[PDB]
Every structure is written in structure tokens, then in C-alpha cells.
Amino acid sequence: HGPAQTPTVFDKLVEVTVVDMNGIRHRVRGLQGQSLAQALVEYGFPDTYFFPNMGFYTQHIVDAHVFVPKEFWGKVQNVDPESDDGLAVKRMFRDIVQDYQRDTSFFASYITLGAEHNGMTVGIGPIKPWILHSEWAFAGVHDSRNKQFDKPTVEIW
Amino acid sequence: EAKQFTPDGKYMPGIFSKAKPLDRSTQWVHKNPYIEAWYYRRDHFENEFVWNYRTTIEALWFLGGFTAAAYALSVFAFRQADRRSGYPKRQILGDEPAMVLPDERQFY
Amino acid sequence: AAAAAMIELDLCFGLLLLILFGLLSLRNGHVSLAHIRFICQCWLVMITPLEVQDFALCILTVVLLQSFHSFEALLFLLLAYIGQLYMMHSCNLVSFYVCLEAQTLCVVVLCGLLARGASTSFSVEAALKFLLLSAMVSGMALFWFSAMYQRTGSLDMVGQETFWILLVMLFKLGVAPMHMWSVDLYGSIPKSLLLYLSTAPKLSLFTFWASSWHHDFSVGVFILFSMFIGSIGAYGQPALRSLFAYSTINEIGLLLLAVETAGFHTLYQHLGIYIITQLLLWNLTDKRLFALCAVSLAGLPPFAGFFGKAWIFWHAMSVQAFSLLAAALFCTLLSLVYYLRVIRLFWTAPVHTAASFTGAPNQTTLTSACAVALAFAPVMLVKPFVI
Amino acid sequence: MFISVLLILFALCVTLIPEAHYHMVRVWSFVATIIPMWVVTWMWWNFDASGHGLQMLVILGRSHLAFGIDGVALSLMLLTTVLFPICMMLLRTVAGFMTFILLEVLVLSALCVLDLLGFYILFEASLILLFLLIGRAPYGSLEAAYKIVLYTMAGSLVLLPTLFMIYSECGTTNVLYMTCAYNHQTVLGWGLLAVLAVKIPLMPVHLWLPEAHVAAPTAGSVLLAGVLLKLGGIGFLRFMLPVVPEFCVSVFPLVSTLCLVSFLFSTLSTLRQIDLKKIVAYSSIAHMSMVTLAIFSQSEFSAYSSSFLMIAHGLISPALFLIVGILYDRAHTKFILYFSGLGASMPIGSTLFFLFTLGNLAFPLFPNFIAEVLCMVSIFAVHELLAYVFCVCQVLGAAYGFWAFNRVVHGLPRGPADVTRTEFHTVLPLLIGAVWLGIKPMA
Amino acid sequence: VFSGAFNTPSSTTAREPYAKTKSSEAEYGVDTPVPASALKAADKHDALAYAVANAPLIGLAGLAAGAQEAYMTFERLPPTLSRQHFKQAQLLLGIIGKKTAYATLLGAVFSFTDATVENMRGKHDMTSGMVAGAVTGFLFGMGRPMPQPVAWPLAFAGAAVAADFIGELMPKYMKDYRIYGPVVHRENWGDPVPPRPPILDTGAAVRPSDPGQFWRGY
Amino acid sequence: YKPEVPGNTVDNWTELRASWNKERASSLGTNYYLNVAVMGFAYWLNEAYYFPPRTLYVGALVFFALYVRKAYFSTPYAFKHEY
């Protein structure tokens, strides 16, 4: 231990360029170890962009459909397609995305921001109408100014 | 060189103190990664079961073989006990109607 | 002489006065209608006869009306109660058809009316599917009633055509494999109508079955379908609404096992315990009591759900219905896993309960705390009580 | 009965104490388990040994739940009331205190019930408590909790219709009239075998124990090993042998081969274990197999010898779990490869470990020696070879016991320091009980 | 009652068999008649006629599974394939017909092997069901990787064994079971004799195996 | 220690995406066809309750062995342009 640098937030900052569904580019800052869906929520994106992670014991996690370029395909975390997490991802692809799926389609909670994501450009993918319960649904149209960040709780019930 | 007690007793936590306090985790082991991996693998060894040749053969001759040996020995001991007690042939499970439960009012 | 029909005239006069009072109250711009709800509850008490089942339905509907707020919803629930009450007294297929159709129309309209937010179109979609599926079952009932009426020349419910009427009754209880309308309803429609749908019509229809129904057939394959499909579906569906829909299919399979072996006393005991648990389930604000519903719907011993399952098992073993009983025991072993998932979700978690801001502070703690005392009912359940 | 209501209501008052008074919460929860130990000792004082088999009876009308005392229930109740304050000394939260208080109520009422439906209601009402105790979030294992709960539920669900079958057959589930009526013994015998062969770990329905008894905390392991396995033995001795004796004769070759293969295969598995808690956990299966065969022999004084082995196991194996729990609490591992030379660094703990190792291997001056001798007298009187199988395999138990002791106690000194006053007093009542019951057990 | 010396019920037995217990003032059963198709389907003396009587019911299960799979395949068809009605009909009818024929084959093999071993051994016991299950499961398990040519005979034999134990042996063992009236072989206890067995309106899957268990009807 | 996820992330994620690039049908067709099947053909099982138990048990096992699961169901016919 010596005269080495004091830790700053700028050492742990990750910048991601996000293109929303209107084509507008956005600058999104996050921290290392934070997932991508959390940084998207804290940036101030509307609540129609997000949906529950459809696994058991993880519906309190919000998730988004993102398009990831081929260079950053290998930095998405690995999911066993035979495990229960794999069936959760399969349920999300079956029910939420459907025929908006591309070869670049991932889910934003499965991306953990590190230094390798610095400068990565992603885009928000479209989703189909869905319902979890009466207090959390999506009718299909992204016409709402309510941010996801302003919701005090994520309710599974 | 920490000081966790006042001169009249009175334990102090030393939350903001510079010196490292001696506590419950003072003698916790430094984990060897390969030992932790080997114990994890032995903890989940049911994922390594496979119906190959050796598994099938050893499960037949030792597990089923000694189970059949113990069943044969148990039946042998039961029959010999009934013969050395003056009883007739007695009804075990699946053995046609016969005598079960000797009467105390009877001399055998 | 019409002197034996004053309760019917009282029903009609009360409806005529209640509509006019609701009109006068709305001309003043009243944004709350607790006075209308009290008059509705008084009308419910005043039209109900002095039988056990009739008053069980009456007290249940009085408790249910505290979760509904508009005038039209209260009117639809009263006119659904008329069908629910008079189906228990129906001794023909004429009145049976009219009571069932009144209930179906009221449920469809309430599903359309009460939806709000982003879940409005999902509720309307599920109401449309329920209406279309209900129309063809109503057509089957009418067609086979016409067949029976032509064959016998009378209104007796005897002969081979009663098998299709029995299938109509099994549709109305959400019995698998005709179960998916209820599964669709559970995923979108709000919690108050889900509370209404799981309690009152099952009581009404089972009382009609106890009172005036005989068939020469069996329901065993539908018992097997309901128990296995409900248990496996609730094991496999991560959404909680679908979990409770499939667990409801499992419970109606157990009630059908109680019907099939005769012995309606175990049926009535299990149905009452289930209805009280439903009244607790859909009015919960503290999530720790969600674990009490879990241990009392899994049949765990000291709580009242154990007793409700265990007299069904006892009477099934008494008349030696061995295969259906073995299937019921296997599905009971499976049900414990997802009720433990419920306990993992809502008991082993930090407690957060938001306070009220616009008044009405935790407005149904009385009913939920009263229904949690199903841990004290087992002292009366062990005795020869329900017979 | 009035006393039992008062003890329950005093025990349940732990929840109403405000949590900021830490000393009061500790003292209240410890005294709430001390008092039933005094009451059960008084019940032993009140017992007439030349009187009736069932004494101090009470029946609660038409609600089932009838109670009475015999020798087996009284000895097991004394052991449970000893074991529960030691569990209270190993917990730190009000949730733990309340779970163990509810468990003590259920165990004590289940040990002396005389109604089969009452036994069913009282025993497996502890299932959800065991699930929460084993699958606790940061340091438990949900897989183990699922296994123990699902195996117990499977056995209980097999029993429940047969219980109701005899209830419809004669009109009651009271054991005094169930033993005097004519019943279809094959069906009820299979139901009772199904519950009690899961409670007692008998192969093949034994796989829940190695996961659950290791994933549990030290207090949970003390309770599960020393108490809850013996509910299967008291189930055999109180309900199954008196009510279905024809079945109990006809199933003897099958129960006999299950006991023999459980003993041999579980002893063979214990030798390859590399976890100290898993070593202690497997060794209990062979002892319970000897208990079950001694119960089923019915030959000389079979209830006496089998109850005495249940008490000797319930004294010796919780102490081994306590020593492993000390090592885990102050070294954060249960792995044999991390421990060596514990004689030089924990001389008192190693001495206690050696004495309880010798006790677990049924050496003399321990109650296990008297227990195994009398159990083999009961087994020998049916046939000599059924005793010979247990006699010749004594090298296999001593192999794992001395190998585990020699690997962790001798060698290069590394590991934690010696025991504290609190750890010594958790161990100490079991040692005094062992010395008494192994030297002068009777008068 | 409870001593450490011995277990008295283990040696306190009857010295003679008992007489039949009178349970009601009327000792004749009341029940609905069995249809003649099931009466004929119980007969095992003609192995071919037994298989012909039993196999269509086991083929009904394959018909149900095939109809399910056919509808689930039809729903996923794109419009360029779904509008070709002859091809659609032959695909869906192929799926249904293959399932129905495979189920009927497995059922006929099981029933014929069961009645053949029945007539060959000269007696009715559980061996014929186990052999028929082993044959049928080996037919199902052929051509598959290897846990399966052993696992499927075991599953079909286990289904046969469960069928014998639950549906045949346990009702036979409990023919003298009574839930009402005097306790059987304990008539001295004094429980009163009703005028009749209890009338229960049970379903067709719950029928009295003895005339004295209950009266079934309405 | 934590176990490694088996496989490659790109290959696993392509396996997760497979057969779901299609609009899901509404459930009204499945529900209507189920109700039609029960209301038209469930009377065929009326005499089956009296059949021997070996036949009923083997038929139940046969229905379980030939059952196709509705969840995660996919056909190759969904993505081909000719039969």
C-alpha cells in the first residue's frame, strides 16, 4: 500500500449507447457489476419497455429485450438450456418476444456490465402484449410517460 | 494489539478501531480451491452415475446379490426357528393360508 | 291465494325501490355508496329462507359485497345471487337453465365492467372467450333437455340424457379437461371477481346436486383428469394466478371424489374450509398470512385444510374406492411442493407493507384476521359436526 | 393436563417480550425448556413400577388425543427434556427459540399419545418447522429440506387411509380397543411399515437423512438424531406390534433382510465419507437397524433392550454432533482435509471426542455396550446367524470411527483453540448421563 | 398392557374359526346390473376373444393422444400449408391413425399374452400379468438406447402388479369388511343391527364387492 | 466454488431462441376443441368403468406413454414451405 490512486466512481463507470424503438440514441452510464436492465431502469426509460423475468423465484427482477452486436455476443452470461433457468428464458422467448426475435436478441438482466461492455451499442427490441396480474400488464402500445424507476415496488402479486 | 475490554469488564466492539479485533472468525480456515472443488464434486456425485457395463454388473452381483442372500438367510433362520420350537410350517407373506401366531393356551 | 309468496313480492319490491334510491343518490354526485351497499345486504338477508345452505350462501354474499363499489356491480351481484339462490331450489331443467344463464350473463358483464389499467383488454378478451365457450355448453344443455322431454313426455330427470346434463354441470365447476376457461379467467380478471368466482357458484351448484340430482353414471375419469392436471399444472406454472387456478382444479377433483363415493358431509366440510381460505386469500395485504393459506391448502395436520381433506379420504376408504384414492394421495404429495414454493416466496422474505395515504387504512384486516382463525375451528371439526 | 397448558402458555410468552431486552429473552427461553425437565423427572418419581402398564391417563372426550405413560415413553420423554435446553444454548434468535419450543410441544405430546389419529396429527405437524429449520436461507440447504419433507409426507400419506380403514372397521383409533378388535392386519401393517420405515432410516427410504442431518444447524442435528428417529421405534413398540401382530410375524423375513442390508451397506458407505458431519450422520443408520431387528425379534426382553439402545444412541450421537458443531463454528469448515493435530490444540475437545467415539463403537462402561449385548441376546434367541451377522461386522464400525478420529486428532497441529465454558456445558449433561447409564443403570 | 417383558397380543389368538357375522335384518344385495360387454370382456378361456374384447379400449387411449397431437400440429401450420386440404387431412389422419394402431397393438399383445399364460399355467395369479407386462414393455422399448429395453418391461409389469394389488387382491381380502352394525367377530360388544345395509348413491366406479357392504342405488 | 455452465454462450442462446420466432395462437381454438371432444365423445367411456382392472391400468399407462406435452411444443412443419 502506497501513494496509489484514491478510488473514484469514474474508474467503475461503463458507458453504453442505447437506441430506443423510435431510433433516438441515448447515452447510458452504469457501474461495474450492475446489470444492464438496472442501468436502463435508472436512466429513466418508460415502464412499457420492461417485463418480469418469468422464472420461479425471480419475477421481482425487471428485464428488457435488447439487440446485441456480434462482437459482444460472447459477453452475455451462459445459460444451460436444460436447466430451469433455460426454461425461464425459453418461456420469455415463447411468450413476450414471439416474432420480433432476431439472432441478436438477448435479455438485459443476463448482461452484467463490466469494462468489456464499455462503448457497446445496443438497441431496445419490441415485445408483444403480456399480463402478469391486474396491476402489471402491457396492452401493446408504447404510449406512456411513466418511468419504471418511479414505481416504489415490483409486485409479484 | 486490540483492546476489546475495559479495565472493569465491559466488552467493546471496536467497529471504527484500526487494530483488527479477535472474534469468532479469527481461526476460520483459508480455503484451498482444489479441496473445495473436490468436496463440491463429491457432494454432487449423483450427476456422475451412468448405466455403463461396470455399473450394471456391480449393481447386479453385489447389491441385488447380497440382498437376495440376506432374504434367503432370513427365511432360513425363520424356518429353522419354527422347526426348533415345535411349530408346523408358518405363513410368511405370500405363502398360502397356514399357522401364524402360536396360542399361549397350547403346548407345542 | 298468494299469501305463501310474500318473500317473492318482497324481492321484487325491494329491487324496484333500490334502483330508484340508487338513481336519487347518483343525482347528488356521491362518489361513494356505502348506504347502497348496506341496503343491498339488508335485501340479501330479507329474501333468504331458513335453511343452512341458503344462509351460508347469504352470509357469504354479504361478506363479498364489501369489495365492490359501483352501483351497477352491486346490481349485477344481486341478480346473480337470485340465480344462485333459486338454483338450489330448482327441481327441473327449465329453472336450472334460467338460473345458470343468469349467472353466466352477470359474470360476463362484471368481467367487462370492472377491469382497469393496462389489464382492461386482457380481461375483456378472457370474458369473450368465456362467453363463447359458455354458449355452446348452454346449447348442449338445451338440446339434450329437448331430447329427454321428447322421450319421457314429462320433466323428470331420468334416463341416458342425464349424462350430458352432468357434463354441463362439470363444465360449470371448471372440471378438467373442460377447465381452461377458468385458467383464462384467473390470469387477467381482477381479484374481487376471482374471489367471487371461487366460492359462491360452487356452493350453489353442489347444493342443487345434493338436493335434486341422480345419475346412473360415473365421474371417475374427470376426477383423475382434474387431480393430475391441476397438480402438474400448478407445479409447472410460475405465475401465481395460474398456480392458484390449477390448485383450484385439484381441489374440485377432491370434491368430485367426495361426490362420487356419496357421503356429502365430507364434501360440505371441505367446501366450507376452502371457501374461508379463499376469503382469506384474495383479501390479503400482509404477505406473511399467505403462508397460512399455503399450509392450510397443503393439508398439513393441525390446520383445518387437513381435516377437510382427511374426511374425504376416510369416506373414500370406507366404501373401498381404492384407485381414485391412490391417485388422490399421489396428487396430494405433489401439491405440497408448490405450496412450499408459496411459503418460500412470501414467508422467508423481508416484510414490507405499504401504508394507506388516501384514507381507508388497510380496510379488510377484520375479515382476513378473522379468517386466519381457522387454526381454532379444528376443535369443532373432529367431532361429528357436519353431518 | 392443566400443568401442560400452563407450560405451553409460559413458553409461548417469549414472543411478547420486546426484543431490546436481550438478557430477558435468553433467560426466559432457557427457563421455558428447563421447567418440563423438572416435570418429567417428577413424573418418573410418581411412577409405580409394580403397578399397571399404563399410568397417569387422560382422555379428551370425542376429540381423539388420549395420553398415558409406559416405560418406553417415559425414558424417551426424559431424554427429550434433557436435549432441548442444550438446543436453547445453541440458538441466537427468537425465531429459533420459537421453532424449538413448538417442536418440544409436538414431540412431548407425540411420545405419550394413545390414539393413532392423534399420533398422526401430532407428529407430522412438525413438517413445516423442519422445512424452515433445514432450508434456512444463507447457510442451510433447500434440497435437503425438500428431501426430508417429501419422504416423510410420502410415508404418512401411505398410512392415512389404513388408519381410517381400521377406524371404520372397529369404530375407534384408540389403541386399547384397536388391539382387542378383529381387523384386516395386512393393509394396516403395510401403512404402519410405510411411516415407520421412513422415520427410522431403513433402506431404501433412507436418503433424506444424510442431506438433512448435515444441512441442519447444530441444534437441529442434536434434535433430529437424538429424538426424531426414535419416534419410529416408539411407533413400532406402541402401535404396530400390539395392533397388527400377525402381520408383524409374517413380515419378519422382509423386515429382517431390510435391517441386515441397511446395517451392512450403511456401514460400508460410512468408510468412504470425507465430511465429519456426514460420517456422524451415516453411523446412525446402522444403530437404528439393530434397534429395528431387536424390536422385531420379540424374543427375550425385546422392548427393554431396544429402548435401552434408543437411549444410548440418543445420548452418544448428539455429543458427536456437538463436537463437530464446535469445529464448524470456530473453523467454518466440516472437511477432514482441513483438520489435523487437534489433540495438541484442543486437548479437552479431543478427549471428549475420543470418549464419545468409544461410546459410539459400543465399548464397555458406556450404555451402548449393555444395549448392544442385550439387543444381540434378543436377536440370538430367534436364530444364531442373525446375531452372527452383527457380531462379525464390528471391525467395520471401528474402522471408520478410529480412522476419522486418527485423521482429525493426530498429526501436525492446525486448527482452532480449545473449548469454552459454554461448549463444555453443552457437552457435559450427556457425559454424566453416559457414565451413569453405562456403569450403574439400574437398581 | 405395555411391559418390557413381552407383547401379549402376539400370543393371544382364537382357537377356532368364527361363524359369519349377521350385519342386517336383510341379507340380500341391491345393485345395478353390469353391461354384457364387460361381462364378456372378463372371460379369459378364449385368448383370442379376450384380446378382441379388451384391445379396443386400450386403443381408445392412443386415439385420444393422437387427436391431441394432431390438433397441436394443425394449429402451428402456416397458411401456405394449411389451405391444402387433402395434404392436411392425410398428415393429421396419419398422426392419429399411427397412435391408434400402436395403442391397439400394445393392448392386443398384452391381453393375448395374459390369457395365454393364464391358460398355460392352469391357474389365475399375478405371474400372467407380470409376463404380459414384460412382453408388452419389451415391445415398446425395442430399438431405444439402453436404460430403456429394461425400463419399459419393468414399467408395464409394475402397472400389471399395481392393477392386481389395488383392483383385485385388496377387494377380495376385504370382502367381509363392514363399516356398520356389529363389529365382525365381536358381536358380544353389542353394536345394534340395522334393518338393511346403508343405501348409498355412489358412482359406477364405486360398487359393492360384497352384497353386505352397502346397497347401491337411489 | 461455483460450477461452470456447460457449453458455449452463443450456442446455448441459439438453442434457447429456437422454434419461438412465430406469433402464438389464441387459446380459443384449443378450448373449443377440448369442449367439443368431451361433449361429443366422452360417452364412449361409460361401459369402460366395468372393464377388468388390468385393462384399465394398462390403458392409463398407454395414455401416459403416448401423451405429448403442450408446453414447449414445436413442430418442424411450422417453418417449411411445402409438405
Ligand SMILES: CCCCCCCCCCCCCCCCCC(=O)O[C@@H](COC(=O)CCCCCCCCCCCCCCC)COP(=O)(O)OCC[N+](C)(C)C
Ligand atoms: C420397557 C421398559 C423401559 C426401559 C427403557 C430403558 C431405560 C434406559 C435406562 C435404563 C434404566 C433402568 C431403570 C430401572 C429403574 C427405574 C424405574 C423403573 O422401574 O423403570 C420405569 C421406567 O424407567 C425410566 O423411565 C428410566 C429412565 C431412563 C432414561 C434416562 C436417560 C435420560 C437422562 C439423560 C442424562 C441426564 C443427566 C443430567 C445430569 C447433569 C418402568 O420400567 P419397568 O420396570 O419395565 O416397568 C414395569 C412394567 N409394569 C408397570 C407393567 C409392571
